[PDB]
Amino acid sequence: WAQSRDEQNLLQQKRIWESPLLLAAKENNVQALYKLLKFEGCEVHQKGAMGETALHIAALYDNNEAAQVLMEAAPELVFEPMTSELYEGQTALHIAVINQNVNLVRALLARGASVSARATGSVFHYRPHNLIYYGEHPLSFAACVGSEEIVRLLIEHGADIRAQDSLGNTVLHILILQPNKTFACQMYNLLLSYDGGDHLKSLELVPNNQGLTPFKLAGVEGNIVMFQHLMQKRKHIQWTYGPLTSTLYDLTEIDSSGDDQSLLELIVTTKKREARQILDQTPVKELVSLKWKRYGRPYFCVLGAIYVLYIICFTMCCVYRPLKPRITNRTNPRDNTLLQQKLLQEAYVTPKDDLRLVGELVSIVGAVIILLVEIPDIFRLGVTTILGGPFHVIIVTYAFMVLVTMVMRLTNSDGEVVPMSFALVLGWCNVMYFARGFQMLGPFTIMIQKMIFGDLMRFCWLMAVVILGFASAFYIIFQTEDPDELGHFYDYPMALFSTFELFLTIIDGPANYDVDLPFMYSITYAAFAIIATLLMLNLLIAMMGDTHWRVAHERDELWRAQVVATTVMLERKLPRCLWPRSGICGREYGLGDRWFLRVEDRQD
Numbered sequence: 001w002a003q004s005r006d007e008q009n010l011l012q013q014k015r016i017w018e019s020p021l022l023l024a025a026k027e028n029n030v031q032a033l034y035k036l037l038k039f040e041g042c043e044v045h046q047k048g049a050m051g052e053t054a055l056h057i058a059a060l061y062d063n064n065e066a067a068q069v070l071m072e073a074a075p076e077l078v079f080e081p082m083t084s085e086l087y088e089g090q091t092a093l094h095i096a097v098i099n100q101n102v103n104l105v106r107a108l109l110a111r112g113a114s115v116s117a118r119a120t121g122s123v124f125h126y127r128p129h130n131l132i133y134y135g136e137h138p139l140s141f142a143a144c145v146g147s148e149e150i151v152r153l154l155i156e157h158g159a160d161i162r163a164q165d166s167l168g169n170t171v172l173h174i175l176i177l178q179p180n181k182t183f184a185c186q187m188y189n190l191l192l193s194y195d196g197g198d199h200l201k202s203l204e205l206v207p208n209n210q211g212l213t214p215f216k217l218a219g220v221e222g223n224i225v226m227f228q229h230l231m232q233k234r235k236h237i238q239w240t241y242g243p244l245t246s247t248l249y250d251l252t253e254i255d256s257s258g259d260d261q262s263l264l265e266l267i268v269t270t271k272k273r274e275a276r277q278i279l280d281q282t283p284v285k286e287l288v289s290l291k292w293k294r295y296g297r298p299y300f301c302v303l304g305a306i307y308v309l310y311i312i313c314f315t316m317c318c319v320y321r322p323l324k325p326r327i328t329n330r331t332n333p334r335d336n337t338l339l340q341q342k343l344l345q346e347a348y349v350t351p352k353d354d355l356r357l358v359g360e361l362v363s364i365v366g367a368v369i370i371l372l373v374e375i376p377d378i379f380r381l382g383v384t385t386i387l388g389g390p391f392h393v394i395i396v397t398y399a400f401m402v403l404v405t406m407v408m409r410l411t412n413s414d415g416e417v418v419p420m421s422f423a424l425v426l427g428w429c430n431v432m433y434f435a436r437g438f439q440m441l442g443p444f445t446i447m448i449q450k451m452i453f454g455d456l457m458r459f460c461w462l463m464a465v466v467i468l469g470f471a472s473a474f475y476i477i478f479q480t481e482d483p484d485e486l487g488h489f490y491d492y493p494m495a496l497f498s499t500f501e502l503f504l505t506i507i508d509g510p511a512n513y514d515v516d517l518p519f520m521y522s523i524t525y526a527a528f529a530i531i532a533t534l535l536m537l538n539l540l541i542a543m544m545g546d547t548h549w550r551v552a553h554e555r556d557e558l559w560r561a562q563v564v565a566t567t568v569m570l571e572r573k574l575p576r577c578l579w580p581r582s583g584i585c586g587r588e589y590g591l592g593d594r595w596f597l598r599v600e601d602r603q604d
């Protein structure tokens with residue numbers, strides 16, 4: 001798609017090279033353009049490719065000596081914005097502020113220019129293909145390029161500090177998205193110097209269109225530099241006891257007060273890898289440790305002891321399935337037949353089956369309770385880098401499978417083990433979710449997750465590629481030999497199964513010492529062993545070897561997040577009689593109704 005602007009920028013320079021007026025304005029030839037405006041009166045209001053003016057060109061290629069003439073010969077071009085869609089709304093002041101041309105900006109204000117010129121051009125939007133996002137106002141441009149002299153001159157001419165963009169962002173919301181956090185921190189405080197001054201209606205309370213104060217946005221963006229610079233307005237010093245320093249934190253726009261207004265709600269839902277780096281700062285790291293030590297760790301282990309026993313009961317009733325003989329004289333049709341089906345669909349006898357019946361009634365409510373607490377979370381994606389994604393799928397597919405096994409219990413089939421088997425492994429594989437905040441196997445469980453999707457999925461595709469060539473060759477060689485003393489590949493499905501069974505050295509390999517096997521097998525099996533058993537398989541060890549310590553730190557950082565994120569989940573879906581709010585009420589004491597956190601440190 002980028003060809004448009006590429007062609008347009010090429011079509012731009014073509015028309016500049018074509019029309020001799022803008023060619024002189026681009027190259028700043030004041031002696032030549034005077035011959036055009038007055039002698040052979042040139043069309044002054046020429047509109048180029050992007051609906052631009054000749055003044056817009058002199059501001060681009062910083063030629064302030066030529067634009068001085070255009071202001072003295074036509075001082076109304078300053079009010080002309082770019083008429084194209086790419087640069088709609090952009091004026092000559094924006095380019096002069098971006099390029100930081102002081103005497104050009106200082107002369108534009110001597111002739112009047114809209115300091116609120118909403119540059120709504122398409123390339124000014126906050127998009128990935130747009131390399132920067134300096135906002136829509138010339139004050140944001142001056143603050144983005146980091147020029148105090150331009151910022152105050154716009155304030156000296158009535159610039160709007162709290163001017164929101166299209167996305168509801170003020171001008172502070174844009175500074176956080178900038179890379180140069182070192183110098184932008186100075187610009188932020190300098191920009192706040194022109195605040196309304198009152199205790200209300202300040203810029204740090206004006207939220208994004210999506211409801212994000214600048215303090216909240218810094219956490220989602222992982223801008224630790226701008227984040228800690230915003231903490232000084234909120235933190236409170238208690239006393240100076242030598243090296244010690246008791247510090248009080250305003251704890252307001254951080255702790256989970258209401259619903260989505262929690263700051264930790266954004267850290268756990270975002271995908272930005274630098275947001276995981278936020279919960280190590282001096283207010284958050286201590287709080288999440290307190291919320292996890294008390295209340296956090298115990299309440300989770302209860303659900304662990306609750307859920308683990310719930311699966312044992314379901315397993316205890318699954319292992320005690322109904323029992324019936326064959327019922328049919330089909331004992332020999334296809335000698336390979338070996339089934340012994342289950343019993344009546346009613347089965348109203350009640351000796352000790354009433355003991356197994358109550359467990360089935362225990363297994364149905366746990367599934368619908370899961371559905372009654374997880375189906376209300378129909379949030380798109382958010383599942384399988386993410387945290388509790390796969391388990392929710394494991395849990396809701398387990399619950400749906402048992403709800404099928406209850407429908408399968410009646411009316412249909414004979415021994416519906418399809419919903420019995422799925423709801424058994426998933427029920428036990430889900431207890432790996434209750435790892436997480438458990439010291440030693442928390443980073444373990446996220447590592448095998450980061451390994452089942454990465455190196456294992458790389459290996460599984462190349463593994464399936466190999467066996468299909470051999471299993472077909474194995475079936476072909478053994479679609480003509482006896483399946484009674486060997487026949488590991490009697491039908492093509494078992495050919496694939498027995499060949500795949502040999503990729504992992506599970507079975508013993510076909511090798512009967514009473515037959516003259518097709519020597520193609522002896523050759524095909526040897527090449528199958530060298531490639532698959534050591535070259536392909538031992539390299540999986542080496543592939544798991546390198547990519548382990550490469551992520552042996554991000555896994556722990558992910559583990560702290562999934563410990564903190566799980567600590568956040570309980571505080572929401574649990575009531576209030578248990579799990580009280582962290583901190584101390586600001587009222588009664590000197591403050592009022594707010595909450596504060598006590599933290600001491602140690603200098604040197």
Ligand SMILES: Cc1cccc([C@H]2CC[C@H]([NH+]3CCN(c4cncc(Br)c4)CC3)CC2)c1
Binds near residue numbers: 433436445446
């Ligand atoms: C901490 C944590 C949270 C969520 C998931 C996990 C891992 C273990 C459980 C899951 N896997 C995959 C799904 N499932 C399965 C079962 N049978 C065959 C196949 Br393929 C797959 C169980 C194992 C996924 C990765 C860890």
Ligand SMILES: Cc1cccc([C@H]2CC[C@H]([NH+]3CCN(c4cncc(Br)c4)CC3)CC2)c1
Binds near residue numbers: 549
């Ligand atoms: C099969 C297997 C299992 C586990 C590890 C390995 C090797 C991978 C490379 C690793 N070591 C250390 C990481 N890295 C390093 C080397 N020197 C100094 C510094 Br600090 C770091 C590379 C060497 C370990 C040895 C092989």
Ligand SMILES: [Ca+2]
Binds near residue numbers: 506507
């Ligand atoms: Ca063996």
